[PDB]
Fold:
Amino acid sequence: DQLRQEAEQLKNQIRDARKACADATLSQITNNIDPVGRIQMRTRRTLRGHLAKIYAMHWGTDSRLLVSASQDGKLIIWDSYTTNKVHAIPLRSSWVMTCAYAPSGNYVACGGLDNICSIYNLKTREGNVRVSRELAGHTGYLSCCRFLDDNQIVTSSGDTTCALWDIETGQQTTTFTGHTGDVMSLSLAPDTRLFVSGACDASAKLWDVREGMCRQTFTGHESDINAICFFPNGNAFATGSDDATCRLFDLRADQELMTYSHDNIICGITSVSFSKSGRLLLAGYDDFNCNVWDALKADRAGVLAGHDNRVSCLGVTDDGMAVATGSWDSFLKIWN
Amino acid sequence: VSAEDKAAAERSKMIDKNLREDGEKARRTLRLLLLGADNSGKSTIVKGIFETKFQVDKVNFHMFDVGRRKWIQCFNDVTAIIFVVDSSDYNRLQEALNDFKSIWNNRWLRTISVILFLNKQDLLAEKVLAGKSKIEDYFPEFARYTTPEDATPEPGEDPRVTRAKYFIRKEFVDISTASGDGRHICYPHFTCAVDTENARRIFNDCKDIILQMNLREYNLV
Amino acid sequence: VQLVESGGGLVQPGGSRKLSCSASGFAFSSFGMHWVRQAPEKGLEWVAYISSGSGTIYYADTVKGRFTISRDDPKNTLFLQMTSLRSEDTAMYYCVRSIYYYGSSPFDFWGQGTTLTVSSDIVMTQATSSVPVPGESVSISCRSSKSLLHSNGNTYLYWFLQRPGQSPQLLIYRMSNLASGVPDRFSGSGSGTAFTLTISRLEAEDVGVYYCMQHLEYPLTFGAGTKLEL
Amino acid sequence: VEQLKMEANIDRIKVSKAAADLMAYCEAHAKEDPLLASENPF
Amino acid sequence: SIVIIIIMTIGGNILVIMAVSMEKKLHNATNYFLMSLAIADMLVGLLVMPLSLLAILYDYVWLCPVWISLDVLFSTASIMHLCAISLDRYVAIRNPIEHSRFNSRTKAIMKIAIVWAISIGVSVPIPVIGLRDEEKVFVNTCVLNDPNFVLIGSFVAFFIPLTIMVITYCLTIYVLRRQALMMQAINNERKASKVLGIVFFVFLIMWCPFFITNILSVLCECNQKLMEKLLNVFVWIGYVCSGINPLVYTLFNKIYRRAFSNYL
Ligand SMILES: CC(C)CCC[C@@H](C)[C@H]1CC[C@H]2[C@@H]3CC=C4C[C@@H](O)CC[C@]4(C)[C@H]3CC[C@]12C
Ligand SMILES: C[C@H]1CNCCc2ccc(Cl)cc21
Structure:
């Protein structure tokens, strides 16, 4: 009876603190910035071979190798320049939802509705790809995973928690609690000190890896948050939701900067990404295509319109010369 | 091109061959999703994710039981959904109706037919005959209901259980008829804990579903 | 990872004999295989090659019509059938494992070998016969008749070491990639038609004959060999 | 209550500076962005 | 005057051809075979119809020795396509699961190849004999006189397909009657029977008169003047049922109705 009023007073204090800093908007300082113009991108490669919906995709650090996962139960490594296949990896379960590629190029990870994250070793003397470890402990399904190094990985699940794992022993070293709903997406900072997580409670949190504490909580969306990307300099969020809106958050002004929306878009958003310089923001929709946004102006610079079903995957290479997309029509396309 | 690139191309071609080989076996199995509440008797209708397999007349089926807002999206390619309701617990039928409405009107399931099992009929018969609890206590509109003239009761059945069964089945069928517009169909059935025929019913309904798809493909409907 | 060769012995000119190799410890069906020959006073020579799926077969220009290479995946054995043997066929025969995909190491493991007793090409040139020489720096050179640099950015040069009583061991592939298990004392470089190998600090285990091989076009060719005498 | 109190103690800056930093970063690395024939590997 | 039927035939064949490529989302195994039928009908309209009108205008000759062959070829192709559709629909209703498994582009290619392979056999000797025997193609003036072809190729072109189609119709109606005894699941199985009846009777009425007159004109001789006058009017009914088949097989699926409304 006494504590709810204290919580409301603290929330009002935070709300009043945030309003004091809103002395300008992006829409006014960018009045002196030229538009990017019209951007045309064309298909350069088509990658064929999957027999089911594609759910996950990830680039390597050398900008040629690519990993993808689908409901046919197989995980494929592609050579983007020649379209040759390098490996084909069977999965023990076909209900896969995420995959990731190690920054050193030695390992690959995946997981799904089996509540387990599985790690594969790509470099053996026998010539085969083998399973190295199974990480158990979550109670919901596994929604996203990313490597920090060869021995540390972060996972997010549908049981409202996040975890940091020690791959050598298979034990959970930090558990991150504080959400009230299912957790969808993670994005790891370039300096590998902080990560950001979205959830079905329409909020986003900033976590400190080394201590296990929540530092900030952001709000504003009206429905589930499906995707998060992390601006290159380490100080901004890009988030997308089922309410057909994208938003840009700042960690130092601790409030929203710009909203990306249009009257003709009434479907949800599946994927969000940036280019190297941060000028373009790429987004996937249920309207069977992908839009190109001007991150500093909230205009629409272009569109990619080559798929016959939902776009589920979107990614950009480390050298910035290519974009890959994936759909439920079982195809991948390389754009430039 | 270099000899090493030709060897890489041969490896890629062999991988494509083996990917094509595996797909042929996958298409020969029909996949089913099983949903239902506790106490409904899900586990007995054909007796992270639990699985079961069974075969009738040389056609294989694969049924999945998970454990609903998010994981449901990946089950939009299944042939049919099986939904099981306990028909002998009057307090919790409104929950079953609300769940049925939430599954019928889901935007990711707009082309999937539902096979509906109304379970535990013997307990309903015993309770209606005993008369210690009445439907009118929870459903006032039952006081005005009459058994239709085209009813086909099983011989020997008391004409107070047929009224209850048809009222309960009407309550579920009425939701399905309000929306859908011909793209997907509901298939009601009455069952009990001791029945064994349940496997054949699924086979017949699946054959009907595939027949409807083939008729639509040929510009006949 | 183990490869064992069998067969061999003494034959008369005009006869025939068949060799076999038994593989274990790895996915035999995923690798391509080579036969390489060494004569007492000649160095190494390439003989034949069979692809992993038995798709393609190549032969040397001195053995076409006389030698036949075959594969048996379910039993993990290779065979080489030889007919109409000549005096020039007396030599040591080695079995070599190879796999090709982006980033692989195609000549990593060599067998032990067996003995047989009877009774346009790119030229790779090495010329010093012996380098006299612990703790000193040594540089060994090779030179080719045609450029080994392909338009895709790769240059196809390989280095091998043969210690006394041992099979050749892979050191460097594609001119600069240090093979697994090798200490970081070895390095290599070059451009176009001239190549060098550098050893930063010698030990007692760095004594033997060093070979160069090119892998642009078939037939495969080797150099004469440079002997390092400590 | 504890989490709100901890979040309340943040050293904040103005929106204009945070946005100017984003503009400056975008302008600084513009020449290295190849999406914004002899060089294209595809 | 009569030339209007050529325009309608060409327009409908173009509409059927376009409504598969642009509209997309159309399964090859059943929607590519309609394109082949449409092409055969358009080629009939362009190579067959315009030149008989010339003879109507002159009541004489000029053509004949190859024009006859081309007419025979393309009318045979259309009839063979209709028979193939009938067999495929029957197989698709009685055995749904195996049909679903079998469906691939390797059936569409086979079907097109076989129908066109049978189509050319009957027209090859038409110029072979005519160019070495003027009387066979000019009588008294372009008409194929020789009984040795009229009484042999006509059974393969018409009379066997008719038996196959009537058997298929009876079997398919029986199967749809039996299944409904097990609600929208029942109502959808009656519209199909209505459609099949319509198609079978249109085929039967448009094609039967000409071939009966054609057999009587040879085996019953019978005033030849009456038979030739009747052939001057019956053969044009067989031509007209080349702009009707591309429609009656199409404008029942709302996708095609919307595509035709928006495209035209
Ligand atoms: C009119 C002429 C030229 C065409 C003849 C082709 C006919 C016979 C073709 C058309 C469609 C075909 C069927 C298509 C699918 C199947 C299912 C398969 O599991 C067995 C064969 C079977 C049953 C085929 C039999 C042959 C078939 C009926
Ligand atoms: C006599 C002609 C010309 N009219 C109609 C076309 C046709 C089809 C088949 C055959 Cl066997 C013969 C003919």
